[PDB]
Design a protein around this nucleic acid. Structure first.
Ligand SMILES: *C(=O)[C@@H](N)Cc1ccccc1
Ligand SMILES: [Mg+2]
Lengths: 29, 69, 143, 238, 165
RNA sequence: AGUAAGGUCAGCUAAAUAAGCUAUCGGGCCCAUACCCCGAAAAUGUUGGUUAUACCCUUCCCGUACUACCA
RNA sequence: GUUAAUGUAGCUUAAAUUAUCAAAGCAAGGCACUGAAAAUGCCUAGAUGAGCCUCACAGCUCCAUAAACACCA
């Protein structure tokens, strides 16, 4: 029985599709 | 903007010395090139083989007449 | 006979199942000619007066390099905007030609261009003769 | 149709022939880069022969017990002299040709380190205005082909020029003076296409009164402020 | 947990690509060559050929870095194997030759992905304008034949191929 | 059905150091043929995995083999 | 000249003598570092559009950007 989240999900802003277009972190700091 | 990349260096750690050598093409045009020997200028010889038999005969008579008087 | 053909076919497939080797770049592989051949420069002496002007000059080179990027980035920005604004403007007036101007037209590639030379080619020049041998150390391997 | 007249202009550009002079700042850094190359390098074969002379000369000074007095024939210093004499005797062309001295703005042998954009003079309304070559668009013909046709319409030309795809590179809209302005022809739309001049040049029939070649620095003088602005947008400074 | 509203808060496998590992038996450069989109050209190879190693690589780096700033995908920045030619000049008052010099050629290739049809004019304009000195720019299509030069020669197949024919 | 078990030159065997004999091809000896002497070529049933291969395992295929009983 | 939109660095924070410790963060560059990128080390450049108003809220105006009526071959 899936429930609805109470607010915005953390990583839902970024687009799953077209991964190459999004710039990566490239660093650990 | 033809001088935006020529200013560089041989990015290596164990490389032999290079010297500026002005190499002239088949025509009178020259391009600056680094070469092993400290020679000042070098010319590119003509590939006589590529010439056709009528073109080769044209180049055959020129040198023989030039060497003679 | 027919069995010999079978092995020839099989030998073809066996060699096919192997990796396609790539020629190593000898430019990035220094030969043993320079491998400790006593050809080491003496301990380099750096004048203090030379060091201060050398380092200070590099600071200006960093600033001057940024100047080149600024004008180049602005130049391509205007060139992109100029072409983009004309393409969209023409589309409203002439939709039929807009489709022709945007579709991939194989009229550009190949675009082989050479760089400028130090001196222009002189008139009536006769270079000497000779021949061009190509040593080009061959690399053939079998599996 | 439309009140505007469709025109296809050709922006023929000559690539530079010689490398542009180094700026004073670049000269100083070029010396530094070359200096670092020598410091971080090994001894070349010629530099080995420099010590080879030292090896033999030192024997000629103190160790006069050399086994073989034949040795070589030439010297490393002598070899450089051999190439130096040939180089000094040999002469090359001049970067600044006679066109620069005579300010012949028609020949292609001027400003070999710069870029020349073709300009022609056209008479419209009993007035001569220098402009880029252009032609009127025709049915069953793409706008790029209009610029392509303009190259073939030049007076006794053999030039071969590579174009740039099919998309345009600029635009310029002007309206006719109210004396001759009508609803049928309100004005015209000029579209510019860039091309690279590979080889070929105009004949000797007409040179001064037909076409000139100028750079972007002096491009404004032959043009007018309204037409000048749109041309400078797509012309990359070089 | 499924029923909790905080389900799937740890999802990450949809953020990174699958990154298929290079299997020992499946190791192969499977390149889906794209050809002829509406406004996107196919895979192109920017062949930069010059006689000097330092000058050829210096302009090769500029092309690769320029693409990144312009959001142009670069698949690889490999280098074509070098070719060495023995320059022989003719001797005057004679016919027998002599070894003049040894000149080599260095080629650097920056393979690029598809680009918008409008950007083709703009991108190439920057490249050919910045050719420093004698660098032979060559923007050709990425056919398998142009990519065959990077590999070695296989006389073992040529022995079979000749007999097959 | 199940289980067992094998494929190697044209052919048959032994080793995996792919050999030996014969057949096949070329030459010599003889009037000719065969014998004989000399020289050469020739293969691991199949797919995949065995550091990498081969003798191994796996897949495919051909063929071989035993058993199928108490009511 | 006139009619309609906008103007902290490349985007953007605080700020905008409204008060406070203060013009920030990320980009963008040079050099070094197997050969490309990327990391890492060292290191370079800097704006509060302009004035007025309010001096204890912040906006109007000017100028400029920029489109328009509109000079044009
Ligand atoms: C330019 O000012 C006009 N004279 C151009 C012209 C328009 C129409 C007919 C002839 C000339
Ligand atoms: Mg790097």
């Amino acid at each position: 029985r899936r429930a609805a989240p109470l607010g915005p999900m953390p990583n839902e802003d970024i687009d799953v599709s077209d991964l190459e277009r999004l710039k990566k972190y490239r660093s650990f700091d | 903007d033809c001088n935006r990349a020529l200013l560089t260096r041989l990015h290596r750690q164990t490389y032999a010395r290079l010297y500026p050598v002005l190499l002239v093409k088949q025509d009178g045009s020259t391009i600056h090139i680094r070469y092993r020997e400290p020679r000042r200028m070098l010319t590119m010889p003509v590939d006589l083989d590529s010439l056709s038999p009528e073109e080769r005969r044209a180049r055959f008579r020129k040198r023989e007449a030039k060497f003679k008087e | 006979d027919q069995a010999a053909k079978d092995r020839l076919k099989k030998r073809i497939r066996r060699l096919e199942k192997a990796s396609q080797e790539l020629i190593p770049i000898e430019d990035f592989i220094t030969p043993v000619k320079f491998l400790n051949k006593e050809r080491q420069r003496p301990p380099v002496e750096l004048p203090f007066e030379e060091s201060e002007r050398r380092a200070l000059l590099l600071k200006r080179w960093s600033l001057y390099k940024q100047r080149e990027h600024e004008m180049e980035r602005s130049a391509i920005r205007s060139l992109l905007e100029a072409q983009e604004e004309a393409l969209q403007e023409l589309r409203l007036s002439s939709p039929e030609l807009h489709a022709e101007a945007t579709k991939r037209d194989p009229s550009l590639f190949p675009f082989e261009r050479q760089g400028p030379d130090y001196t222009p080619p002189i008139s009536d020049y006769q270079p000497p003769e000779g021949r061009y041998q190509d040593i080009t150390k061959v690399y053939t391997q079998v599996e | 149709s439309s009140p505007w007249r469709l025109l296809g202009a050709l922006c023929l550009q000559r690539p530079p022939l010689v490398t542009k002079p180094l700026t004073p700042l670049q000269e100083e850094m070029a010396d530094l880069l070359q200096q670092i190359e020598i410091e971080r390098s090994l001894y070349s074969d010629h530099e080995l022969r420099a010590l080879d002379e030292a090896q033999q000369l030192a024997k000629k000074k103190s160790d006069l017990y050399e086994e073989e007095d034949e040795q070589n024939i030439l010297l490393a210093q002598d070899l450089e002299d051999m190439w130096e004499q040939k180089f000094l005797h040999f002469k090359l062309g001049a970067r600044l040709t006679e066109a620069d001295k005579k300010d012949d703005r028609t020949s292609l042998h001027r400003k070999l380190d710069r870029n020349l954009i073709l300009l022609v003079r056209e008479k419209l309304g009993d007035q001569d205005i220098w402009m880029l070559p252009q032609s009127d668009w025709q049915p069953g013909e793409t706008l790029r082909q209009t610029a392509e046709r303009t190259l073939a319409t030049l007076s006794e030309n053999n030039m071969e020029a590579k174009f740039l795809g099919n998309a345009p590179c600029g635009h310029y809209k002007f309206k006719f003076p109210q004396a001759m302005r009508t609803e049928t022809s309100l004005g015209a739309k000029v579209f510019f296409f860039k091309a690279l001049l590979l080889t070929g040049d105009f004949s000797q029939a007409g040179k001064k009164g037909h076409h000139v070649w100028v750079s972007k620095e002096e491009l404004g003088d032959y043009l007018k402020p309204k037409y000048l602005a749109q041309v400078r947008r797509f012309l990359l400074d070089l | 947990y499924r029923s909790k509203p905080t389900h799937g808060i740890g999802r990450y496998k949809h953020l990174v690509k699958a990154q298929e590992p290079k299997k020992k038996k499946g190791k192969v450069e499977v390149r889906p060559i794209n050809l002829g989109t509406d406004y996107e050209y196919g895979v192109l190879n920017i062949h930069l050929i010059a006689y000097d190693m330092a000058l050829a690589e210096s302009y090769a780096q500029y092309v690769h870095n320029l693409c990144n700033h312009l959001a142009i995908k670069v698949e690889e920045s490999y280098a074509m194997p070098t070719k060495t030619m023995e320059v022989l000049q003719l001797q005057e008052q004679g016919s027998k030759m002599f070894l003049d010099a040894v000149l080599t050629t260095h080629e650097r290739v920056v393979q690029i992905s598809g680009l918008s049809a409008t950007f083709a004019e703009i991108f190439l304009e920057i490249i050919h304008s910045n050719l420093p000195e004698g660098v032979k720019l060559s923007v050709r299509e990425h056919t398998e034949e142009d990519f065959k030069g990077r590999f070695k020669a296989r006389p073992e197949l040529e022995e079979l191929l000749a007999k097959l024919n």
